[PDB]
């Protein structure tokens, strides 16, 4: 019982850039972009969509780099998310209804304002490694057990 996610980071030599979601599911934090897969959609393709639909930007080369599956206690459906890094983008950032971003200096990353899980996996994608996690939350501010392992193929 899972539903597919795509999730994008904009990462650079020097600087990441997140964006602030103004409404639905992760509102209040710095998200990277991403969503639900679609019918007859790759997961490549769904990953591309989403990071143009969010914030504008038109990107080249997308590089795998983790799987996490999040569970909420109590609800039915786990959330598969398969997680992409890009540096090679085309466009500037756009401001929205639904997202404002910003670059953020990779000393500088504001983990208090992300989900709680960030702090646990976005220090591997920093540095360049691969990884596949599993996340337990009751609700959304409560890691009740995690796992996380590094990997050579996602
Ligand atoms: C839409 C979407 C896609 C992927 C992940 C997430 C959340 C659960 C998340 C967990 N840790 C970072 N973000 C959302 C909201």
Same mark, same amino acid.
């Given at each position: 019982? @899972? ?7 904009? =990462? ?10 103004k *409404? ?11 969503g639900?897969?679609?019918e007859?959609?790759? /997961?490549?393709?769904?990953? *591309?969509?989403? =990071? ?6 038109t ?13 909420? %206690? ?8 398969? %997680?992409?890094?890009? $540096? @090679? /983008? !085309? ?5 929205? $209804?639904?997202? *404002?971003?910003?670059?953020? !200096?990779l000393?500088? /990353?504001?983990?208090?304002?992300? #989900?709680? $899980? $960030?702090?646990? #996996? ?17 609700? !959304?501010?409560? /890691?009740?057990?995690?796992?996380? *392992?590094? %990997?050579?193929?996602?």
């Amino acid at each position: 019982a @899972s539903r597919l996610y795509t999730l994008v980071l904009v =990462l650079q030599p020097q600087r990441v850039l997140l964006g602030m979601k103004k *409404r639905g599911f992760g509102a209040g934090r710095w998200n990277g972009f991403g969503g639900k897969v679609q019918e007859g959609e790759t /997961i490549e393709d769904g990953a *591309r969509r989403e =990071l143009q639909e969010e914030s504008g930007l038109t990107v080249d080369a997308l590089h795998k780099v983790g799987q996490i599956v999040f569970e909420f %206690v109590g609800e039915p459906e786990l959330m598969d998310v398969h %997680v992409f890094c890009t $540096d @090679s /983008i !085309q466009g500037t950032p756009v401001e929205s $209804d639904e997202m *404002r971003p910003c670059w953020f !200096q990779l000393d500088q /990353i504001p983990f208090k304002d992300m #989900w709680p $899980d $960030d702090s646990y #996996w976005f220090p591997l994608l920093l540095q360049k490694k691969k990884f596949h996690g599993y996340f337990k939350f009751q609700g !959304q501010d409560t /890691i009740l057990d995690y796992t996380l *392992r590094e %990997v050579d193929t996602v």
